[PDB]
Amino acid sequence: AQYEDGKQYTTLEKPVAGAPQVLEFFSFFCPHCYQFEEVLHISDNVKKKLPEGVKMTKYHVNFMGGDLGKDLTQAWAVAMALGVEDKVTVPLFEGVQKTQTIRSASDIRDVFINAGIKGEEYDAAWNSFVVKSLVAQQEKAAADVQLRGVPAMFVNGKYQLNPQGMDTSNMDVFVQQYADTVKYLSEK
Fold first, then answer.
1. Across the strands, what pairs with 152?
2. How many domains is the chain built from?
C-alpha cells in the first residue's frame, strides 16, 4: 500500500498508554535536530496538516551535551511552563549550534531574558517543582518509547516515524512525506 509498516513508520512492540497524540523528541545539541527544526521545519509542517483536536507535543532529551544538555532539558521545561516555546526555540538552537554562545545555564537564561521573559519569572520557574515534574515527564516519555536517538516522533503512543524509509532528495518531498505520514498515523 501507500503507507507501510516498516517503510515510512514502524510500530512499537509495547504501545504507550496515555501518550501525547503527536510526540516529538529533540536536543538543542543535535545537528540533525537543527536541520529538522530550523531548515526543514518538520514540526511546523506536521502541524499544518494535523486533524482537528490533535495536539503536537515536543520534549527535550538529556543524553547529548552532559551538564548543559540537562540544563537545556530544564530550560525547555521552563519554556513549557511559561508557554514561551515559540519565542525561545530559534534562539536556543542558534545559541547552541550556530553562534555557540550558549555554554552554561546562565547563557541559556540570557536567551529568555533577551526574549522578554522577566528574570524573577524565569528563576521562579527554573527552581519550581512544576518544572522538576516537567523534566521528569520528558525523561519518562523517553523511557516509555524506548528512545534510542533524536530527532524522533511517535504517534498515539503506538507508531514511530521512520524517515530513513522515506525519500531523501527534495528536502521538500521528504518534508511533505514526513508530514503526510504523521497525518495518516493520527487517523489510524
1. 25
2. 1
